[PDB]
Design an enzyme around this catalytic site. Structure first.
Site, PDB file in Angstrom:
ATOM      1  N   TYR A  87      27.776   8.071   7.872  1.00 40.30           N
ATOM      2  CA  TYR A  87      26.409   7.718   8.218  1.00 40.30           C
ATOM      3  C   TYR A  87      25.898   8.552   9.387  1.00 40.30           C
ATOM      4  CZ  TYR A  87      29.440   5.054  11.343  1.00 40.30           C
ATOM      5  OH  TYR A  87      30.420   4.657  12.227  1.00 40.30           O
TER       6      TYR A  87
ATOM      7  N   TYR B  35      27.255  -2.399  10.541  1.00 41.14           N
ATOM      8  CA  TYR B  35      28.317  -1.999  11.460  1.00 41.14           C
ATOM      9  C   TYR B  35      29.672  -2.357  10.873  1.00 41.14           C
ATOM     10  CZ  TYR B  35      24.586  -1.259  14.756  1.00 41.14           C
ATOM     11  OH  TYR B  35      23.429  -0.755  15.300  1.00 41.14           O
ATOM     12  N   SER B  36      30.552  -1.367  10.776  1.00 41.15           N
ATOM     13  CA  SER B  36      31.894  -1.588  10.246  1.00 41.15           C
ATOM     14  C   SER B  36      32.622  -2.581  11.137  1.00 41.15           C
ATOM     15  CB  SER B  36      32.700  -0.278  10.218  1.00 41.15           C
ATOM     16  OG  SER B  36      32.157   0.662   9.314  1.00 41.15           O
TER      17      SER B  36
ATOM     18  N   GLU C  95      32.741   6.676   3.624  1.00 40.38           N
ATOM     19  CA  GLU C  95      31.687   5.857   4.187  1.00 40.38           C
ATOM     20  C   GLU C  95      31.226   6.562   5.459  1.00 40.38           C
ATOM     21  OE1 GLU C  95      29.980   2.748   3.126  1.00 40.38           O
ATOM     22  OE2 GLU C  95      31.357   1.313   4.063  1.00 40.38           O
TER      23      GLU C  95
ATOM     24  N   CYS D  28      35.659   7.938   7.375  1.00 41.47           N
ATOM     25  CA  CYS D  28      34.564   7.173   7.954  1.00 41.47           C
ATOM     26  C   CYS D  28      34.085   7.810   9.241  1.00 41.47           C
ATOM     27  CB  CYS D  28      35.008   5.730   8.217  1.00 41.47           C
ATOM     28  SG  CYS D  28      33.679   4.611   8.689  1.00 41.47           S
TER      29      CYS D  28
HETATM   30  C1  LIG Z   1      28.098   1.408   6.357  1.00 40.82           C
HETATM   31  C2  LIG Z   1      27.689   1.723   7.783  1.00 40.82           C
HETATM   32  C3  LIG Z   1      28.586   1.469   8.833  1.00 40.82           C
HETATM   33  C4  LIG Z   1      28.236   1.748  10.198  1.00 40.82           C
HETATM   34  N1  LIG Z   1      29.174   1.470  11.176  1.00 40.82           N
HETATM   35  C5  LIG Z   1      28.846   1.729  12.486  1.00 40.82           C
HETATM   36  C6  LIG Z   1      29.788   1.406  13.556  1.00 40.82           C
HETATM   37  O1  LIG Z   1      30.880   0.903  13.354  1.00 40.82           O
HETATM   38  N2  LIG Z   1      29.392   1.693  14.865  1.00 40.82           N
HETATM   39  C7  LIG Z   1      28.114   2.279  15.161  1.00 40.82           C
HETATM   40  O2  LIG Z   1      27.878   2.491  16.329  1.00 40.82           O
HETATM   41  N3  LIG Z   1      27.227   2.543  14.195  1.00 40.82           N
HETATM   42  C8  LIG Z   1      27.527   2.295  12.876  1.00 40.82           C
HETATM   43  N4  LIG Z   1      26.613   2.560  11.901  1.00 40.82           N
HETATM   44  C9  LIG Z   1      25.268   3.109  12.259  1.00 40.82           C
HETATM   45  C10 LIG Z   1      24.281   1.924  12.611  1.00 40.82           C
HETATM   46  O3  LIG Z   1      24.045   1.149  11.435  1.00 40.82           O
HETATM   47  C11 LIG Z   1      22.942   2.465  13.129  1.00 40.82           C
HETATM   48  O4  LIG Z   1      22.475   3.481  12.251  1.00 40.82           O
HETATM   49  C12 LIG Z   1      23.072   3.046  14.557  1.00 40.82           C
HETATM   50  O5  LIG Z   1      23.675   2.097  15.446  1.00 40.82           O
HETATM   51  C13 LIG Z   1      21.682   3.432  15.020  1.00 40.82           C
HETATM   52  O6  LIG Z   1      20.736   2.185  14.937  1.00 40.82           O
HETATM   53  P1  LIG Z   1      19.725   1.880  16.029  1.00 40.82           P
HETATM   54  O7  LIG Z   1      18.999   0.609  15.598  1.00 40.82           O
HETATM   55  O8  LIG Z   1      20.285   1.862  17.302  1.00 40.82           O
HETATM   56  O9  LIG Z   1      18.774   2.970  16.072  1.00 40.82           O
HETATM   57  P2  LIG Z   1      17.351   3.273  15.329  1.00 40.82           P
HETATM   58  O10 LIG Z   1      16.194   2.787  16.131  1.00 40.82           O
HETATM   59  O11 LIG Z   1      17.379   2.963  14.008  1.00 40.82           O
HETATM   60  O12 LIG Z   1      17.084   4.754  15.399  1.00 40.82           O
HETATM   61  C14 LIG Z   1      17.810   5.787  14.656  1.00 40.82           C
HETATM   62  C15 LIG Z   1      16.849   7.035  14.569  1.00 40.82           C
HETATM   63  O13 LIG Z   1      17.462   8.115  15.401  1.00 40.82           O
HETATM   64  C16 LIG Z   1      17.998   9.181  14.527  1.00 40.82           C
HETATM   65  N5  LIG Z   1      19.373   9.356  15.032  1.00 40.82           N
HETATM   66  C17 LIG Z   1      20.519   8.695  14.604  1.00 40.82           C
HETATM   67  N6  LIG Z   1      21.621   9.069  15.257  1.00 40.82           N
HETATM   68  C18 LIG Z   1      21.183  10.016  16.152  1.00 40.82           C
HETATM   69  C19 LIG Z   1      21.900  10.820  17.171  1.00 40.82           C
HETATM   70  N7  LIG Z   1      23.190  10.733  17.384  1.00 40.82           N
HETATM   71  N8  LIG Z   1      21.102  11.696  17.904  1.00 40.82           N
HETATM   72  C20 LIG Z   1      19.738  11.809  17.700  1.00 40.82           C
HETATM   73  N9  LIG Z   1      18.999  11.113  16.792  1.00 40.82           N
HETATM   74  C21 LIG Z   1      19.764  10.228  16.042  1.00 40.82           C
HETATM   75  C22 LIG Z   1      17.870   8.684  13.104  1.00 40.82           C
HETATM   76  O14 LIG Z   1      17.670   9.741  12.198  1.00 40.82           O
HETATM   77  C23 LIG Z   1      16.678   7.680  13.156  1.00 40.82           C
HETATM   78  O15 LIG Z   1      15.409   8.228  12.958  1.00 40.82           O
HETATM   79  C24 LIG Z   1      26.914   2.305  10.483  1.00 40.82           C
HETATM   80  C25 LIG Z   1      25.994   2.573   9.413  1.00 40.82           C
HETATM   81  C26 LIG Z   1      26.356   2.293   8.069  1.00 40.82           C
HETATM   82  C27 LIG Z   1      25.346   2.595   6.985  1.00 40.82           C
END
Ligand SMILES: Cc1cc2nc3c(=O)[nH]c(=O)nc-3n(C[C@H](O)[C@H](O)[C@H](O)COP(=O)(O)OP(=O)(O)OC[C@H]3O[C@@H](n4cnc5c(N)ncnc54)[C@H](O)[C@@H]3O)c2cc1C
Length: 304
Positions: free
Chosen positions: A304, A85-86, A302, A262
């Site tokens: 995602y 998370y940024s 950056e 971003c």
């Molecule tokens: C460098 C970097 C910076 C980031 N900064 C931020 C930040 O500042 N704020 C933030 O909120 N997140 C940010 N993220 C994204 C965060 O890391 C997660 O990917 C996000 O919060 C989802 O994780 P989760 O554990 O909730 O879901 P997970 O259980 O991991 O599930 C995600 C699954 O759902 C799918 N999916 C993802 N998005 C969606 C969507 N919108 N609709 C339908 N399906 C979807 C994926 O393909 C995957 O299979 C960043 C990622 C990176 C790599």
């Protein structure tokens, strides 16, 4: 000086930057101090702004990220994988004491074509945090989105959704804080794209910034479901940029112009499309040109 300098000099502030101080095996255990929903009730996603105590043990810099290990175990009794998370706060922090870190988190929730609701593990864990709760943190992570050393640089920030995070960090240091070693006097231009007005993150903050630095800061919003251009097209970030296509193109040709992007993966395609047409106005190939800008640290991405 006649001193040994073998390494490459970057145009970004890399001096003193630390990465991976805390790893998954032994994360830092912070505590939630605040957690507030910053989107309107009618917003389609729901985003939260949270602050964690760090005791100043995590010396992060603007533009970096931290990892979060959500509580619980997977099917094999193993911990959840790290989610990055940024950092949405400046190095000094929202409390101005260099002892906290803030995150901007969107609650991931969606319905598949089976009518079943699915929830992201880490995003829902973070958004459900209550003040007093413990949080496992790792990092800091990343060197890509570090700020330019040039205090008079032109910084163009392109963001969609939570991609606004690293830029809130930039902007707080640029306009809300007094630094004796860093006095920004360049041009900060922010483009923020979101679906609805109720999804306009930190709008009040940028308004106060525009008020105290009217000639160093410019902001342009792109609300896709509410605005349209003369052609009747939805106002996506690239669509808003197109209104300033002349100015942006001219700025990109300058040596002190740095572009940071971003947000949601795929926002780069729309931006490239607008750039390809502009590039060929001067007989230039955009992709060959973007590569050049990257080498010069003038195009940082950056998504995602
Ligand atoms: C460098 C970097 C910076 C980031 N900064 C931020 C930040 O500042 N704020 C933030 O909120 N997140 C940010 N993220 C994204 C965060 O890391 C997660 O990917 C996000 O919060 C989802 O994780 P989760 O554990 O909730 O879901 P997970 O259980 O991991 O599930 C995600 C699954 O759902 C799918 N999916 C993802 N998005 C969606 C969507 N919108 N609709 C339908 N399906 C979807 C994926 O393909 C995957 O299979 C960043 C990622 C990176 C790599």
């Amino acid at each position: 000086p006649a001193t040994a300098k073998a390494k490459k000099e970057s145009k970004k502030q890399e001096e003193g930057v630390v990465t991976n101080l805390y790893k998954p095996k032994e994360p830092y255990v912070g505590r939630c101090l605040l957690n507030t929903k910053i989107t309107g009730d009618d917003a389609p996603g729901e985003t939260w702004h949270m602050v964690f105590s760090t005791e100043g043990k995590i010396p992060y810099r603007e533009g970096q990220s931290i990892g979060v290990i959500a509580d619980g175990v997977d099917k094999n009794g193993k911990p959840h994988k790290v989610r990055l998370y940024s950092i949405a706060s400046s190095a000094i922090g929202d409390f101005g004491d260099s002892k906290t870190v803030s995150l901007c988190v969107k609650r991931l929730i969606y319905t598949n074509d089976a009518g079943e609701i699915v929830k992201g593990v880490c995003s829902n864990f973070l958004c459900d945090l209550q003040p007093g709760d413990n949080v496992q943190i790792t990092g800091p992570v990343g060197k890509e989105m570090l700020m330019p050393k040039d205090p008079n640089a032109t910084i163009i920030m392109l963001a969609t959704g939570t991609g606004i995070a690293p830029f809130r960090s930039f902007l707080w240091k640029m306009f809300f804080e007094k630094h004796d070693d860093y006095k920004f006097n360049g041009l900060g231009w922010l483009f923020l794209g979101v679906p609805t007005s109720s999804s306009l993150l930190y709008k009040e903050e940028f308004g106060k910034m525009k008020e105290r630095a009217p000639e160093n800061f410019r902001v342009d919003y792109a609300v896709s479901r509410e605005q349209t251009n003369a052609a009747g097209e939805r106002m996506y970030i690239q669509t808003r940029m197109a209104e300033y296509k002349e100015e942006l193109w001219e700025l990109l040709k300058k040596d002190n112009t740095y572009v940071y992007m971003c947000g949601l993966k795929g926002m780069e395609k729309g931006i490239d499309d607008i750039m390809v047409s502009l590039a060929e106005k001067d007989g230039i190939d955009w992709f060959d040109y973007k590569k050049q800008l990257k080498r010069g640290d003038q195009w940082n991405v950056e998504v995602y």
